[PDB]
Symmetry: D2
Subunit: 263 residues, 4 copies
């Protein structure tokens, strides 16, 4: 069971933390006494998040601005963040490329850009982070969506990127389990959350209820700190069970017995 | 009920058709009397396939050699294949990057190349083909894997790209259904198949049973000509129900109430 | 889509109609202009229901009083009710034995009596009605419970009888589909309803929320009239899917091919 | 991990033990050194089983002949068998009424008689055994079928009675767990088994393969000894997953939390 003391003095990176859920994550970490380093494109927005973190009582707080479209930035961001904190205990991968809802009709560049920003960068970050995470037996939060488990019309590029995160990171978890690598990987599956981006983008099109971002952010922390495989925050107590896919869990357990683990 | 006459005089691209399942797909289409354009990188191997297709009874058979890592090739390949046949009725997307079963050790370049060859090129080919396929009320076969519905240790880059196909193409199918677009999309879910690539790549590592490549190829063709949403060929009548994800089907169905469709 | 016009002039039996859901079912049918014959053991209560049905607009309304513990009453009841209305279109089997919530302690006599009242009478009633129902291509509603799909502490005798109802009536439906017998059978799965009996019986014991009896009654009517296999009224949009058991549906589908239907 | 010495000197009742699975269960217990009392109606068949059990190594073997249609016999049988062995460690409820396959067309007596033999007698036997089983912290095997979890055409009376067993005994188990009563209850879910009765009844109607009775009997004994909630013996490795019903397990878990257990 979660205690906020579990983040006291912990060294945590938060991406996409200028606004929305990621900003709320940073705020909760600050109140728990964590060291944070926040990132996003907007310097202006990030300065303001850092000031507020300090006031809430973070152990320390710093920002680094850049685009996660740029793989070299992602790699160098992590090195400098670990240098600022003297290590890393938790990597929270929360950023995402904004894409307007439309029926797909040939926007290949957006398919490319969505995969770069929402997927390849997450992998780059995690690779860059992995030595420090192994040293501290730390944790990664991979922030995804109900739309990275099922499909929804009007968001094909985004959903493909989120499916990919499941395929990659769940594979990596399985490998870490067999190899006795004590770095936890928590895939966070979120429903509609009441950030600004969401409410505007869905206005007039998607009518589901939205859940509060402040709560959403807290549950992401809690699940990742408890080293959960998955964390569901989706507006219903029943939906996590419909998304949990027990058939997949069965097939994975049985298929594992087919490997020659000695070789 | 499938009849081989359904492919007589039809115009069919097969990618990854120099060997393995792809080659088998090409032979079957030839026996059914289709027009075919095959592709892969190896010009020598494609020629062998084309001569064999002519002998087997193909209406027409041509090849174009190139790499699906190059999105410009992919775009040009379709327009040329379409000029060679005078149109396009079916696009079989079967190619995949050769990989080996090894734990992920941070090989970022391979994640990137896998995603290009296995995923982004499928999208690029589909978009190039879409005009011709709307004209013919045609079909797309998307060749995937059980590893694009559940994860397996030692293949994280491949599984990520395959999961990505499901999120992308399944979303597209749903948009095509609401918009009454007469282009079907069949996600092919394959278990282990006795291609030379799979036998050698699993030897001493993964010891599950394999199914026969010739029948595998015929089942892709059949399920695609019959315009099925999904086609499972996995060595079991039971397993397709544990991969079909009843929970996801329920959520997607219920999701229709959540859109303002008139808008 | 349901229209109340579908029950106008229809000939309907309602059992356990002196209070609770059964009473409400009677009222709703009256408003739609059905003919109703109602039953239970309390004469005075039944006389009040009949009068109110007439006031509300029933084409006709009669009661016959007796105990469904008595299999000869059940049979004779059906014959008299069809005689009163000149036929039968719908059999609503709603009565149940009162049972308090305690741990089972060897009360064998109660296991017996619960099976007589809740199960055997329902079979006997159905058997008596069947000729009339085949003549009208009519319908049976079998009123059951979430406790006829899963188990709950403190109601073992009751649950046993509700489970029997599913095994029996669901087999009968399967036999009727196969034999082109056009009598529909609707298993109604009710969550907690705010009848006086349920409120009293669960008070300080079972604290889950209760749905309104008036709507519950209407939903039984609509689902049965629409000829659904099953009708869930459990106060959740999602729970019906955790109850209706996709695994069972798959198995029943696959097993049907194991029969030698020609024979 | 089961070991056969687990049953050496244990005291076991086997009903329906004159032929079929019940006979094979008696024989396996004998081999393991158990004390057995066997019952069915056929005196002469039970004599043969007893002599053979003694040959195989049974610590002791007795029979009592009688019909489980007779509830008084059932009650007295248990007291007498416990007298004969000086206690009871395991009650294996295996008997069933044979019912010809037929479309249901109003055989109300068969519905009654099947519920008496197949269900009521199991309850009465369990209640009569309960003091001895509480004293030995013993076990009950409730032998059911795939057709006590899903429905099959032509066997409605049988299926109703097996469904009832699940509702009753699974409720009692959940009460025993809460009341810390150490008597285990194992529901045995069997596929088609090659007893002479099954093979003759299904000949030319139901074409599914039948599994061996000898192994079926051993698995019942093993799962019951291991104090499992359910034991599946069915034909396919996948079927226990499909019949396992995770939705029911979830709902039972979450419902249980709605009780005021203090009260
Ligand atoms: N809101 C929802 O309903 C919902 C539902 C399901 C899942 N989620 C998920 O939750 C996470 C957060 O969503 P949100 O609604 O809080 O999003 P948001 O309010 O749009 O915030 C996005 C954050 O990511 C950053 N970002 C965007 N493009 C970037 C780029 N190229 N490089 C670096 N940073 C970039 C932003 O800052 P800059 O613009 O300054 O870079 C911003 O800080 C996402 O992973 C998302 O898919 C959200
Ligand atoms: N075999 C299995 O057990 C199995 C299981 C599940 C799913 N699948 C799937 O079924 C499909 C067929 O697999 P397979 O075993 O038949 O594969 P395979 O025998 O290795 O054949 C792969 C084909 O793809 C082509 N290819 C590889 N790299 C390419 C590139 N960069 N650009 C263009 N073409 C390239 C190949 O020719 P070049 O090398 O000459 O380009 C070859 O024709 C794949 O999508 C795969 O994911 C296979
Ligand atoms: N209320 C709930 O929360 C709930 C939950 C799940 C399912 N259900 C189901 O819905 C149905 C009705 O529930 P309810 O709450 O409305 O029950 P109720 O208020 O107790 O009414 C039961 C009716 O059945 C009759 N009945 C009882 N014993 C009888 C007997 N021996 N012979 C003939 N009739 C008898 C009663 O009248 P007399 O006493 O005049 O005979 C009464 O009309 C039952 O099938 C039940 O299992 C209810
Ligand atoms: N065989 C299958 O495919 C199959 C499949 C699923 C489940 N099962 C289950 O496995 C269990 C055994 O099946 P089986 O195939 O072995 O049955 P079986 O060969 O027909 O034997 C039934 C036993 O129960 C007895 N019995 C029948 N009527 C009785 C009565 N009125 N009172 C006392 N005993 C009576 C019989 O002896 P007397 O006639 O001498 O009384 C016989 O000993 C049954 O519970 C059944 O539901 C069997
Ligand atoms: C409609 C599908 N929604 C419903 C539940 C989750 C999924 C989603 O990720 N939406 C997108 C969309 C609206 C929100 C803000 C951005 C644009 C990012 C997502 C959430
Ligand atoms: C072990 C996972 N197998 C079980 C069947 C699905 C899956 C897989 O896609 N294998 C891949 C892997 C091994 C073989 C050669 C290539 C890489 C392509 C597939 C077959
Ligand atoms: C707590 C189990 N409830 C939860 C929801 C449905 C199941 C039920 O069948 N209750 C019956 C039982 C006890 C109560 C009074 C009557 C007989 C009617 C129901 C409520
Ligand atoms: C058709 C459903 N079968 C198929 C698998 C198990 C189930 C069953 O229990 N059948 C009955 C039926 C045939 C056999 C002998 C009796 C009559 C007892 C059962 C097995």
């Amino acid at each position: 069971k979660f205690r906020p003391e579990m983040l006291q003095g912990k060294k945590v990176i938060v991406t996409g933390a200028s606004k929305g859920i990621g900003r709320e994550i940073a705020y909760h970490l600050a109140k728990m006494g964590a060291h944070v380093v926040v990132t996003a494109r907007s310097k202006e927005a990030l300065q303001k998040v850092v000031a507020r973190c300090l006031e809430l009582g973070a152990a320390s707080a710093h920002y680094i601005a850049g685009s996660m479209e740029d793989m070299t930035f992602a790699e160098e961001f992590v090195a400098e963040a670990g240098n600022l904190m003297g290590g890393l205990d938790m990597l929270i991968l929360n950023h995402v490329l904004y894409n307007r809802l439309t029926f797909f009709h040939g926007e290949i560049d957006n398919v490319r850009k969505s995969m770069e920003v929402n997927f390849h960068s997450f992998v780059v970050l995690s690779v860059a982070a992995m030595p420090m995470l192994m040293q501290s037996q730390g944790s990664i939060a991979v922030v995804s969506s109900v739309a990275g488990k099922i499909t929804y019309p009007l968001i094909a590029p985004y959903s493909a990127s989120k499916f990919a995160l499941d395929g990659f990171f769940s594979t990596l978890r399985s490998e870490f389990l067999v190899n006795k690598v004590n770095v936890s990987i928590t895939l966070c599956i979120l429903g509609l959350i009441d950030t600004e981006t969401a409410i505007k983008a869905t206005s007039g099109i998607y009518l589901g209820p939205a859940s509060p971002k402040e709560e959403c952010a807290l549950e992401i922390i809690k699940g990742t700190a408890l080293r959960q495989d998955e964390m569901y925050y989706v507006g219903s107590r029943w939906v996590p069970y419909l998304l949990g896919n027990p058939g997949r869990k069965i097939m994975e357990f049985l298929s594992a017995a087919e490997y020659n683990w000695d070789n």
